[PDB]
Subunit: 310 residues, 5 copies
């Protein structure tokens, strides 16, 4: 088989569509997601073109019987697992191809606002031109969509749209036609509140009870113990995320909280030192100031951080 010949000099237009059946396994660390979808293709092959004499409105072909464009995905781990569903030819020779495929897609994620982040996942469709003729891709919006039951655990699916204009470019001395299918998602931040955020705030506030205690030994226990629990939360959080060349919102708060523990240790030390030196009136002034300063600076620093990130 060979490509359909051009009537004039026009490129062959392959109309495309992707209909999402299943979305699963959005892996934050790997920056991948798995997809199960319908891929629809349409092009004119005049060699395949009478409905009156044939009495048949449509002809069904097997993939091997006809010429089919070599369509690939750019951002996949391995080539897609595809099963042809149907091939239908209209009297004028317009071919309608439908396959169901599954693929693991590589799509970078922006963790800057984590866990209050949104992402635009991409599925890039591509075709390489043949020596005989140039192949160009188009979007049939009537064949772009997603099943209502499509659920991505821990995310809300906003939209699935295609950028209608392909990116046509040369690659290894041939033309290449690339389409961008976009899946907009937003993270379900709910669970982060009772599981990570609030527990982390509770332990921090517990360290601040040391500002109402003169017992150095109890203070050391309060600040050091809670710091260790903060380290456990820091480790827990970093296990759910990849290493980023930037600060994430959570990372910033987690990092800042270390400074609060560090300054609380200095305060607890200074307080004890003065007490030992028979200067408790002064220690009392530092401790009383700390009772206001620590929560106030904590609130303002968080307002500043939320402002820089959102």
């Amino acid at each position: 088989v060979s490509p359909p010949p051009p009537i004039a000099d026009e490129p062959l237009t392959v109309n495309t569509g992707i209909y999402l059946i299943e979305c699963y396994s959005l892996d934050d660390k790997a920056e991948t997601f798995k997809v199960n979808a319908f891929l629809s293709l349409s092009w004119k092959d005049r060699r395949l073109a009478d409905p009156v004499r044939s009495g048949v409105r449509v002809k069904t072909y097997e993939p091997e019987a006809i010429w089919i464009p070599e369509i690939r995905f750019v951002n996949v781990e391995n080539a897609r697992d595809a099963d042809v569903v149907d091939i239908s030819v209209s009297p004028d020779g317009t071919v309608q191809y439908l396959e169901r495929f599954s693929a693991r897609v590589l799509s970078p994620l922006d963790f800057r606002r984590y866990p209050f982040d949104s992402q635009t996942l991409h599925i890039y469709l591509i075709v390489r031109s043949v020596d005989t003729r140039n192949i160009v891709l188009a979007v049939d919006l009537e064949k772009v969509g997603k099943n209502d039951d499509v659920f991505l655990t821990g995310w809300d699916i906003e939209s699935f749209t295609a950028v209608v204009k392909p990116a046509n470019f040369a690659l290894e001395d041939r033309l290449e036609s690339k389409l961008d299918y976009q899946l907009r998602i937003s993270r379900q931040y709910f669970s982060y509140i009772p599981n990570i955020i609030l527990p982390m705030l509770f332990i921090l506030f517990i360290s601040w009870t040391a500002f109402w205690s003169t017992s150095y030994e109890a203070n050391v226990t309060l600040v050091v113990s809670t710091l260790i629990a903060h380290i456990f939360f820091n480790i827990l959080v970093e296990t759910n995320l990849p290493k980023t060349p930037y600060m994430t919102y959570t990372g910033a708060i987690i990092f800042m909280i270390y400074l609060f523990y560090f300054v609380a240790v200095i305060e607890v030390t200074v307080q004890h030192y003065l007490k030992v030196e028979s200067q408790p009136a002064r220690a009392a002034s530092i401790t009383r100031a700390s009772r206001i300063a620590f929560p106030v600076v904590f609130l303002l620093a968080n307002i500043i951080l939320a402002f820089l990130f959102f």
Copy 2:
């Protein structure tokens, strides 16, 4: 090969059945389960009809390639099913009986609201897309729906395996699609959660309450802080066995509430020490004595409220 032609304008009815051989790997975090089953298909193909007398046979056995077979797929699968055709049998009137053994990884959402005292309805959705030649509709042959008695899903009790007899017929890309819903009802075996997570978590909490019979601030700080850290370990342990949910689970609610009890116990321990240092131990004693009753009482009532909201 082409589909059986319609005598009038009727849709072709494909009778289906699923017989479960194996159920394994119910992954809570992934919301998947693996299945090994028999898939049975039956439809009328008049072009295959024969006379028993003339042929000298009452049944005809074909190879899948020799005859037309409907393109049946599963909606909620990761990848297409691994299937091996077992038998194809044709009766004199052209009634085809197809049997395949398949294995598949199924995506089926789980409701964790009552975890670990939860029940689930797992779904296996069978689907067929119509052809230009004709419309294909699915039906359930109840005589061919079932499960082996030895089918066990580790950590779960299997209640029933039934099919919703009426298919969901709908248009998808200007073609009729016919969808059947096979339902596997399961209930979680909550037993092990009691000695492994629930009771240990209650023991450490009750141990933090011994601080209400102690005037030693340093010992109290050690009791409340140490047990809080152990509670954090249980919280982490629990969340590793579960996916992130946009709602509160029953266990999650109790785990979260217990933090409030630790937080208030720290305030009490602090207030008690502060008053002692201020030479007002009589007040401190009143707060501590009240706490001995208040903490277990509020804990019990809060748990009755939570169990009520969840069950």
Copy 3:
């Protein structure tokens, strides 16, 4: 190809054998094990009879596609076996001798009641479904059932590999099925559990009992709470190596019971401090002295009771 025809009315007997080459990956949590073995099959197909004089050869070698081969499957597998045909030898009378080497991941439930001092009977179920033309039945050729001497299952001792000679013949989806049960008896190597989990867990418990020779409440709180936390770590460690069971395991029972000992030790430490503060140390001393004997004695008797209930 179609099945061999019956001389009279008898079912077709397919003689089977499994020879284990490798055993690996016994996964306790998954209740699976991987197997690499020879599967031997033998049946008479008179349509393959030949004259050694005419054909030159005394035994014919065939390709699987060239002749009729029974559709033999495993019941308790995750996916269909990975099989490679080693030989298909046909003798003059038409007796087929089929040999394949296969690898498969087998689902076989495990009884954890006596863990880590448990023994198991793993099963490999061979099955054949009957056809319309004729009924197929399985048999065991004991001469072709065995295992390589080098077969080792990491962390287990292999006792025996035998087959239940009588197949289980039954109806399934309006056809006959013939099922054979191959049994691999194994016993767990409990050795490593002693220095890694059991003894460390006993040492920390005995360390908490040193609080019965101390009047220091703050040190006692540190002794009992610290060791309890270490016990939680061991509890977590143990539960990671096991699936969730609707019953108590031997280890689980001991681990759970040890929490009660920590809980009562905290009460004792609290009661002792309370009396000391109330200026009644003579009483506190009587409780502490009694605890020095009571704790180890009750621990020993409770363990004798548990070992008795479990073994």
Copy 4:
């Protein structure tokens, strides 16, 4: 099919090119990375030559099976590459232009000496074996070597993708082999190691040094021992992200050295308490005051020495 015959006695030159589409999964522990790329091949096959005029075609397309194609392999791969032929074009003189898209898991050793401030040269080795008919040699077509601008390797910066133009020709199993070295230069994005591991580890160390402004032995023991345990947690965390090396890494050196600082701080805390108990606090005060300067000073100088030895 057989190799193109030599006009004289020359070896057959196969021109190669690799164009990277995707780079992912650089696994430090495994010392592997996954690659998705275009592999281009070019050679002259006189037997396929044609006249453009009498043919009416300027180029001729063939299926891989129709013509002779060199058996090109990768040396440093886990399994053979997953390849799909994209195009095979033949020009009038019989110059074949082959293009495939492949994916492979590549084994490439990493030097962790300067971790996490390290750079690496990943290798993709292309190989061809000679035939008895003729010697097959590889060449680099620089015009066909490159990478997509969107190529991102999570946690790394990609510097360059170049090929060593001169192949390494050598004998292997009595046939000559022609090997090309494609090099991907990368540098680690060390950013995240600063707020996640480096700074937290420094904070806990500095917190242990507050024991030099405390006379309370019990508080000092708590400060030094608690922070040491947190340092152990960071040590464990770091070693989980790395393979076992027969050398010291930069991070490993700092982590190891910090243990010595904790060990000496414990000795100081012990010596201080011992003297205090012996009624010699003046002395203990001299040791403690010296320690306040000595510990940070020795820490700074030791780090300058280490950075010097490693960079």
Copy 5:
């Protein structure tokens, strides 16, 4: 195709060779390693002989399907090898030279007795099953046994790759089997275990011994209990990198013994406090002073005894 016929009554000798290209993924817990290698085979097939002067061709290249090839398998593999035929060459006398490149996951038991100062002999067992026509025997062509210089197994030193030249010929299921043993000798790179596990574990133990220069019971309890917990973390860390063994490993022995030292140190700290409370500090002082010498001395001698028993 059928096997080459015997000139007299001789078995067919298949000469073998394995050339290692890649060694990776030595998994201690699984007792497996992955291999990528060349497998070379050579046998005489007279039915393929040709005249060198008449033919003009010195060697004839065949496709695997065109000629008879012996069914060579690996005994100790998880699944069948992934193999790609590289070349098939026939010399005038009919000597066949076969070459394939394969990849396989090999099961090979490991002896952990001296871990992490252990050495291993990994095995790759090559096997052939005889045919009815004739017996097939394996031989080693030492000229075709080897390994690439760049072959690196992360965390190990590769010593040698040799083959036991004499095959193990035996009957299995009424046919002869010919087995060859290819041995890869490796020694563990113990370096990293010193700064990561050994030294940190010794530091915490020595820190527990500072309690012998302290009269503070509460500080002593904190020193001994805290370091014991850190020792538990190292015990857990070590056991995660190892499978469960029915014997003691060298590291396991030291780790286990260190628990006894912690246990006795707790007894000493308890006895010391008890005597102090009983107003007998002169005695407590004698026990504490003795402990300062006894603990390090008994530790050193016990380690000399253990090293002696293990090495």
